[PDB]
Amino acid sequence: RLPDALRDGNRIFAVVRGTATNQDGRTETLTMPSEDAQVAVYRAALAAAGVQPETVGVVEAHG
């Protein structure tokens, strides 16, 4: 927890502020991804982190 890490003065590399989970549902096949589901989980992560997409400049995709 970031408050406790700051309180104990430990080495901090970076802070994660939001994580989200979503499922594609019934896509075309069992392995087909869903663009809409990906957008939904992006929105959920942005909302949970309390931040705007314009703030983020680097995206590490599954690729």
């Binding site: 075309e28 096949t29 069992l30 392995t31």
Partner: protein
């Protein structure tokens, strides 16, 4: 004396030519029957002409 013959001399798709000869409206029915037959063969089970192949289990490999 020739009796009959059944050799695999199909070669080019006589189906394509016979469909081309037939009026374009017939093309839908013949293609429908061909697809239904082939899909029933590959999926091993008979199928309906309107039910989705997804609900018949047509995977990526299929």
């Amino acid at each position: 004396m020739f009796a009959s013959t059944g050799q695999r001399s199909r070669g080019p798709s006589k189906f394509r030519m016979e469909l081309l000869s037939l009026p374009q409206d017939e093309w839908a029915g013949r293609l429908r029957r061909l697809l239904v037959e082939q899909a029933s063969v590959i999926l091993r089970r008979t199928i309906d002409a309107d039910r989705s192949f997804i609900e018949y289990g047509l995977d990526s490999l299929g």
